[PDB]
């Protein structure tokens, strides 16, 4: 007689299995008759959440094997899905009463920042330039309303003020 053993591996490049997944490795099956079919023991659960994301059991490499004069070994793969991420968006406003932003200023609104981790610090993207001259006068960027904000379970939003000086 022979045994059937198990091992787990990550199927997600750059991610090692956490101990909570390794803790689910099945026990060896013992006393298997030579020439019988061995089938791997399924893990007692197929999902493990961590602070980084969720691991989900995919399958073993073989769903059975014939015992042929040696112990059998089954390799089970788990895959990782990162925890939900958030965005940081931007908006521009005029800080000059009675003056609306021209399109040339609005055209400088930064792109959204994506794939920000929960609990991370977001800092707004600075405009590509900070002055725009028009026939009427010049627009200058002042600042965003905050220098940074912690992502705490929601998208962030930064408001940038431009001021106008007439020609
Ligand atoms: Cl993890």
| 104 shares its domain with 146 | yes
Tokens of 94: 């005029």
Domain total in the chain: 2
Report helix, strand or coil for 164: strand
| 78 shares its domain with 90 | no
Domain extent at residue 156: 85-166
Give 43 Cα–ligand 1 centroid separation in angstroms.
17
Give 123 Cα–ligand 1 centroid separation in angstroms.
26
Query: Are 113 and 145 in contact, with CB atoms under 8 Å apart?
Result: no
Report helix, strand or coil for 58: strand
Give 18 Cα–ligand 1 centroid separation in angstroms.
5
| 67 shares its domain with 90 | no
Give 157 Cα–ligand 1 centroid separation in angstroms.
29
Tokens of 15: 């991610």
Of the residues 82, 111, 136, the one at which a domain ends: 82
Of the residues 36, 54, 82, the one at which a domain ends: 82
Question: What is the SS3 string spanning 86-126?
Answer: EEEEEEEEECCCCCCCCHHHHCCCCCCEEEEECCCEECCCC
Report helix, strand or coil for 82: strand
130: DSSP letter: S
What's the CA gap between 145 and 148, in Å, rounded? 9
Give 116 Cα–ligand 1 centroid separation in angstroms.
17
| 57 shares its domain with 103 | no
What's the CA gap between 129 and 136, in Å, rounded? 19
Q: List all residues 6 or more positions away from 166 whose beta carbon is below 8 Å from its beta carbon.
A: 136, 137
Query: Are 87 and 155 in contact, with CB atoms under 8 Å apart?
Result: yes
Question: What method did the depositors use to determine the structure?
Answer: X-ray
| 156 shares its domain with 92 | yes
| 162 shares its domain with 89 | yes
Give 20 Cα–ligand 1 centroid separation in angstroms.
9
């Amino acid at each position: 007689t022979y045994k059937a053993t198990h091992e787990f591996m990550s199927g997600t490049p750059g991610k090692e299995l956490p101990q909570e997944v390794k803790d689910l490795l099945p026990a060896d099956q013992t006393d298997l008759k030579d020439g019988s079919q061995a089938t791997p023991t399924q893990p007692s659960k197929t999902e493990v959440k961590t602070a980084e994301g969720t691991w989900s059991f995919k399958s073993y490499d073989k769903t059975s094997e014939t015992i042929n004069g040696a112990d059998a070994h089954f390799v089970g793969t788990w895959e990782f899905t990162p925890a939900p991420t958030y965005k940081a968006t931007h908006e521009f406003v005029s800080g000059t009463p009675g003056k609306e932003l021209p399109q040339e200023v609005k055209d400088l609104l930064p792109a959204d920042q994506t794939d920000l981790k929960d609990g991370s610090q977001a800092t707004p993207t600075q405009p590509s330039k900070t002055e725009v001259k028009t026939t009427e006068g010049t627009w200058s960027f002042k600042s965003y309303d905050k220098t940074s904000e912690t992502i705490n379970g929601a998208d962030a939003h930064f408001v940038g003020t431009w001021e106008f000086t007439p020609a």
